[PDB]
């Protein structure tokens, strides 16, 4: 979950 949050932020 920590490891997947940055991908989500970069998409916003």
């Amino acid at each position: 979950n920590l490891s997947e949050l940055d991908r989500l932020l970069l998409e916003l």
Partner: antibody
Framework: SEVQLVESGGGLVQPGGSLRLSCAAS????????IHWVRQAPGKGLEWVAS????????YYADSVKGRFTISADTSKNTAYLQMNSLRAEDTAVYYC???????????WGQGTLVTVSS | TQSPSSLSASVGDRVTITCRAS??????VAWYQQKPGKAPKLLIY???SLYSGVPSRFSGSRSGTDFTLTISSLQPEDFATYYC?????????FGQGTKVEIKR
């Protein structure tokens, strides 16, 4: 606007003492990014300390600092902080701030600041 | 093993570093270069993706549980210390790291 991270604070603190490091960001919005603290004891490897994801309100900590250190962010000042309490000798290290990228990879880094814990 | 391993190499040599961050198959893995008195520089992310601006001689690879960084031809500026990073769902771990020194 060029991306960078400027660290402030640090220095000498006695065991059991408290100290706050600052990480002022520019070129990007801290509220839509992740900030990470990583430290390095003299002649030793990199050690992850803490991470913050302001947008989601998630914070994570290494077991070695859990309950003693607190990571936080001030959106209005575009700055992240590491509050270090109950310091011990083995916390002596150069402390880096860094911005997160895919997979918590760290693309931009601060200049580092030395924290010495000793009597 | 709290301090980085040492490796002696010559300019033009091929070097492959294996990650020891006690990682898993799920892990998102990154690689860094650090020189004395300087902050680390990102080389690889997501196991095998080359970060923007990083020379193509650096490559990352994943084989099961084993994560690897290869420098296909060592250049003078490549002599430095290298670390892998493994990110789990709630934790980041940096590996021991390898310090590449010049053979002479």
């Amino acid at each position: 606007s060029e991306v960078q991270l400027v660290e402030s604070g640090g220095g000498l603190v006695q065991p059991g003492g408290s100290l706050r490091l600052s990480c002022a960001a520019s070129g990007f919005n801290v509220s839509y990014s992740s900030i990470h603290w990583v430290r390095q004891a003299p002649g030793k490897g990199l050690e992850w300390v803490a991470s913050i994801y302001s947008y989601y309100g998630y914070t994570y900590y290494a077991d070695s600092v859990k309950g003693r250190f607190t990571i936080s962010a001030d959106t209005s000042k575009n700055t992240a902080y590491l509050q270090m309490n109950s310091l011990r000798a083995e916390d002596t290290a150069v402390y880096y701030c860094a911005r997160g990228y895919y997979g918590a990879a760290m693309d931009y880094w601060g200049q580092g600041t030395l924290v010495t814990v000793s009597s | 093993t709290q301090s980085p391993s040492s490796l002696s190499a010559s300019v033009g040599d091929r070097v492959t570093i294996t990650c020891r961050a006690s990682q898993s198959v799920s892990s998102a893995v990154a690689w860094y270069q650090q020189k004395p008195g300087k902050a680390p520089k990102l080389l690889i992310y997501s196991a095998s993706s080359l970060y923007s601006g990083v020379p193509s001689r650096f490559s990352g690879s994943r084989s099961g549980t084993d994560f690897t960084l290869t420098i296909s031809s060592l250049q003078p500026e490549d002599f430095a210390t290298y670390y892998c990073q493994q990110s789990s769902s709630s934790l980041i771990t940096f590996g021991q790291g390898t310090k590449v020194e010049i053979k002479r």
